[PDB]
Symmetry: C2
Subunit: 1011 residues, 2 copies
């Protein structure tokens, strides 16, 4: 038989699914959730051997350990140990599409383990082995005898081993196949790995056992009363003496208990379930669960003799909460949710797809620290510990079946096929059976990108029938089909329709009110955070808030899926698609995270944090209105710091305690601020600070901020009468200006400032020139490649229009000596193949103070694709340590992504002014800057800038950040105008019209002087 090429065989001899078991024999240990002696971990060192095919595996390996084998850590992905290559592919299958067949060359991982079993385990009861995650299919032998087979890489596989194990030493033999018919339903946008990547354990259960238990909570109208209903099921001999006691604990206080014998109510004409019981406990004024306040109870389930012999005890954390969709709104405990979510893949730069507690906690700390309240299990059931953590810290979970068939043509070819229903159902049913008790899980998902098939309908109904407590969602086949309770599009824009045939992505605002439509809209995927992205993010959150039935979304995605590789010197670097010899690959498309692989934040993460704020603010005179977006909690760990500053210089500050009811408001009256004499703009800045530590944040954490412009005094005082008059020297090649120790040189052949002198030292390595192009972002490139050009993408439009190779023809270059200054006037035309793209007219005015006033006026042709930027650049000879500016900061910001930025006097070391995006591009811009200080230099005006050791050319010519070499000096980019970054998706033009440079005629002015 070839079971790994048969969608009719998804397992052999596998035990039934169920919620997390520990088989406690003491009820207090169950209650306290302390470790169980009946649940052993088999994690540790195993013997591993790699083979090109299952046929290649030597018959002796079943009976005896192989000498060639190596000792490896388990859990692990065998790609991470370097046995074969991890493959990154986006849509296209890593194998030839020929269901259900896989290549005869199938990388086979032979794991083994010699382990010990106590006599006591074999003298009584049942001894089983649980494999939490095996990718993608595996056969299991024990002591040489075959046990079974199993598929689905993301759910536990369990087998009874009692009749196989002997006292003391035993040996496992797990032959794991990389490819199987299972792989056809596992086509997620991620690294294609394999092996025993989750926990392995041994569970001893009594013969007469708890085989399943469902916990439910239902509520009276105002949620002041609840009935906890627990349905318990058993295996073994049914006897009159059997009972179940379900007790409910709140810390140490037992709030409810119920005891009944077995034998459920009459179900049908043949009776009821004699092997079942339902316990109903009344709970007065229950503490409710939410991501805001994750109140938990502990439910202990005791199977026992009536006379008081505990046979075994299972347990779980209970969260009293209700999820329902009413009148088109998704409600948690009667209140409409606002999903501040992110899509999270299980990824580690070093370990691949093996999850650990430390990492999982770090993710949840960071998510909650950045105002996320939800997470999508994209696109599979997660590690069991994740759901427990979300229960405890507080995050709404979308639990998603392991069904992705994205590379099928058409996408629903398998999911419409009734012969593929058995395999699909197990990915849905065994998910529900495992996780249905977790309070954190609020929504079920039928998978991702598998079109819409009749199998989606059958399964949707199955979950509705089995579990009435949670809405079922699914995006495939149009995101509003009969398979989903929530409209859940991916990358639907706020206002713009993308009306594809059959599966249009309507404006989310437009979608809600289509003829006959009523359901809530929460995007399963939005704001593609690929490279320099997240532009246009605020547009989403303005809409989410304005529209009741727009209840948020899940950002794509959490972490960059980059992997650590090592160079000739042994130095680590972040690698992506293709870097492991893997081909075909979708290159850097695996990196779309708000955080890097090592969990270092991208600059976009702060933009998400600002938008997902839980407190809204308005200003009216001296009164600040604070509005709470919390649904259940009071502002009981919050105060408001406020700061008024004249262009960076602190004027007045104070603290006011935040006392806002959920959905409520607080009017905070500011003290009469004494206005200053000196000119400038007053800036109010408020920050919500948490004075006290929490489970998720430290004392002094900042949860929210906002800024306003207050009064402005425009400067009417002019500089003093100049102490000298600058001299001009004329040559055929050059205009040269001299004043004190300052010197300027304008080349008359080129028409640019080609050198500058402070004292006697050079100041330039490259002349000051106009620049209308940028090192293309990931959103600029889209899907375009050298082999396969996408002409619609921005980068190709600029290339084809000739923007990158257009050369400056000089039209005018003159010098005039004024009464107190010298005036250099120039004009340039940028041309490509007989087409004028840009004209740049400048005046440079240099007076007796030592200041150079540059005035730029640029014309852009209407029929040329809008330029990336409209500015200047040069390579300064200086290399300073610090960058000091008055403008938006501290972090990187761009026109369509600058709401999180605040205007203040910022001071950073040079290296921070560069964002190390793994795929190098235009980066580190700071907008709305009025003054920039770098070493001896000061620039003043109203500009946008970046400043680093790397040129735009080097940036656009390098594919990985580690290959970047610091150039001589410092590359300075000062733009009057910069195009938006986009990011609604990363495969088609996504920069909004209002952030495109399309005015035709642009003006900006800079003053360059020594500070």
């Amino acid at each position: 038989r070839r079971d790994w090429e048969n969608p009719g065989v998804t397992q052999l001899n596998r035990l039934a699914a169920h919620p997390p078991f520990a088989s406690w024999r003491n009820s207090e240990e169950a209650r306290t959730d302390r470790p169980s002696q009946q649940l052993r971990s088999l994690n540790g060192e195993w013997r591993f051997a790699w083979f090109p095919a299952p046929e290649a595996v030597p018959e002796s390996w079943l009976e005896c350990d192989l000498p060639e084998a190596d000792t490896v850590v388990v859990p692990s992905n065998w790609q991470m140990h370097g046995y074969d290559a991890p493959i990154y592919t986006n849509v296209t299958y890593p194998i030839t599409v020929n269901p259900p067949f896989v290549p005869t060359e199938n990388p086979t991982g032979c794991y083994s383990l010699t382990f010990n079993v106590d006599e006591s385990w074999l003298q009584e009861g049942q001894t089983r082995i649980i494999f939490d995650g095996v990718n993608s299919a595996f056969h299991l032998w024990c002591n040489g005898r075959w046990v079974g087979y199993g598929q689905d890489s993301r759910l536990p596989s369990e087998f009874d081993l009692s009749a196989f194990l002997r006292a003391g030493e035993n040996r496992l033999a797990v032959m794991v196949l990389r490819w199987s018919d299972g792989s056809y339903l596992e086509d997620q946008d991620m690294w294609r790995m394999s092996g025993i990547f989750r926990d392995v354990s041994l569970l001893h259960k009594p013969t007469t056992q708890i085989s399943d238990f469902h916990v439910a909570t239902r509520f009276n109208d105002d949620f002041s009363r609840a009935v906890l209903e627990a349905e318990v099921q058993m295996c073994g001999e049914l006897r009159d003496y059997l009972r179940v006691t379900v007790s409910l604990w709140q810390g140490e206080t037992q709030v409810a208990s119920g005891t009944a014998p077995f034998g459920g109510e009459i179900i049908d004409e043949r009776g009821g379930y004699a092997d079942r019981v339902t316990l109903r406990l009344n709970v007065e004024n229950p503490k409710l669960w939410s991501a805001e306040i994750p109140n938990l109870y502990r439910a202990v389930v005791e199977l026992h003799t009536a006379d008081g012999t505990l046979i075994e005890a299972e347990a779980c954390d209970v969260g009293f909460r209700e999820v329902r969709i009413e009148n088109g709104l998704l409600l948690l405990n009667g209140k409409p949710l606002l999903i501040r979510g992110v899509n999270r893949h299980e990824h580690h730069p070093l370990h691949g797809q093996v999850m650990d507690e430390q990492t999982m906690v770090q993710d949840i700390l960071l998510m909650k620290q950045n105002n996320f309240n939800a997470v999508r299990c994209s696109h599979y059931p997660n590690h069991p510990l994740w759901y427990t953590l979300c229960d405890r810290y507080g995050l709404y979970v979308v639990d998603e079946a392991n069904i992705v068939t994205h590379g099928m043509v058409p996408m629903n070819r398998l999911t419409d096929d009734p012969r593929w229903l058995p395999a699909m159902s197990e990915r849905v049913t065994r998910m529900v059976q495992r996780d249905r008790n977790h309070p954190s899980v609020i929504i079920w998902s039928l998978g991702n990108e598998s079109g819409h098939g009749a199998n989606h309908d059958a399964l949707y109904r199955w979950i509705k029938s089995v579990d009435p407590s949670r809405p079922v969602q699914y995006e495939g086949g149009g995101a509003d089909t009969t398979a989903t309770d929530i409209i859940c599009p991916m990358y639907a824009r706020v206002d713009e329709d993308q009306p594809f045939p059959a599966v249009p992505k309507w404006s989310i605002k437009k979608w809600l009110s289509l003829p006959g439509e009523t359901r809530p809209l929460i995007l399963c995927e939005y704001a593609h955070a690929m490279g320099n992205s997240l532009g246009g993010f605020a547009k989403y959150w303005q809409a989410f808030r304005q529209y009741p039935r727009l209840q948020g979304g899940f950002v794509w995605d959490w972490v960059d899926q980059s992997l650590i590789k090592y160079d000739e010197n042994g130095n680590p670097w972040s690698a992506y698609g293709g870097d492991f010899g893997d081909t075909p690959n979708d290159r850097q498309f695996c990196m779309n995270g708000l955080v890097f692989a090592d969990r270092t934040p991208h600059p976009a993460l702060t933009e998400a944090k600002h938008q997902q704020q839980f407190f809204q603010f308005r200003l009216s005179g001296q009164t600040i209105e604070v509005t709470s977006e919390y649904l259940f909690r009071h502002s009981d760990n919050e105060l408001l710091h406020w700061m008024v500053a004249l262009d960076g210089k602190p004027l007045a500050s104070g603290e006011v305690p935040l006392d806002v009811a959920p959905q409520g408001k607080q009017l905070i009256e500011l003290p009469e601020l004494p206005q200053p004499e000196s000119a400038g703009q007053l800036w109010l800045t408020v920050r919500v600070v948490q004075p006290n530590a929490t489970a998720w944040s430290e004392a002094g954490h900042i949860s929210a901020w906002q800024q306003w412009r207050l009064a402005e005094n425009l400067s009417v005082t002019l500089p003093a009468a100049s102490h000298a008059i600058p001299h001009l020297t004329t040559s055929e090649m050059d205009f040269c200006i001299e004043l004190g120790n300052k010197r300027w040189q304008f080349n008359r052949q080129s028409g640019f400032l080609s050198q500058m002198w402070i004292g006697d030292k050079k100041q330039l390595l490259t002349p000051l020139r106009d620049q209308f192009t940028r090192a293309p972002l990931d959103n600029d490139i889209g899907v375009s490649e050298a082999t396969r050009i996408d002409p619609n993408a921005w980068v190709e439009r600029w290339k084809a229009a000739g923007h990158y190779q257009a050369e400056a023809a000089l039209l005018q270059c003159t010098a005039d000596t004024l009464a107190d200054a010298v005036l250099i006037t120039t004009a340039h035309a940028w041309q490509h193949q007989g087409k004028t793209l840009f004209i740049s007219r400048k005046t440079y005015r240099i007076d007796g103070s030592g200041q150079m006033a540059i005035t730029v006026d640029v014309e852009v042709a209407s029929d040329t694709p809008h330029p990336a930027r409209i500015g200047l650049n040069c390579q300064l000879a200086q290399v300073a340590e610090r960058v000091n500016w008055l403008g938006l900061g501290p972090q990187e910001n761009y026109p369509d992504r600058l709401t999180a930025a605040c205007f203040d006097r910022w001071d950073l070391p040079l290296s921070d002014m560069y964002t190390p995006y793994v795929f190098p591009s235009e980066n580190g811009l700071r907008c709305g800057t009025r003054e920039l200080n770098y070493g001896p230099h000061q620039w003043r005006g109203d500009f946008q800038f970046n400043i680093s050791r790397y040129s735009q050319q080097q940036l656009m010519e390098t594919s990985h950040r580690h290959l970047l070499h610091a150039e001589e000096g410092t590359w300075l980019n000062i733009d009057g105008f910069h195009m938006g970054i986009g990011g609604d998706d990363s495969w088609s033009p996504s920069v909004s019209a209002e952030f495109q440079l399309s005015a035709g005629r642009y003006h900006y002015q800079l003053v360059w002087c020594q500070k």
Copy 2:
């Protein structure tokens, strides 16, 4: 207008006049206007205007120049949006083309007189011997802005001596979602803080 600066310079082939003005009310500077005038050998006067607007002042109705010409010509010829009156938030009907109309058509007889007769996106304007060039909005009539705001009925208007010209770099939207509250949408409010426009005045 309080003068801050007024200089004259001589270029190789031109005279350069630089001016600075502040608009103050109760010790508050509302608007700063910085100008250059470049009259060259062709007889053409290049005017460059750079305006600051105080952030805590209500956004201005317009940013432009005005003057009363001695001339009274019979026709008004321009290259821009028309032929009818058009405003920033009401210029979709108007077409960019060459238009020529008698002066009276450049005035709109609203029973309750107000700002009227404007045309946007204009690159060239012709009146008598005068030509104005750039990228501006304009109205042209025998009625001043002052007479219009002080007169309640159209029939009570008298034609003033000469011709009143308003050339704006930037004009605020007119609105009208209703007429009892502010209805000029944000994108049509003059709130950028710093405004630049350049004009050429010459003869033809």
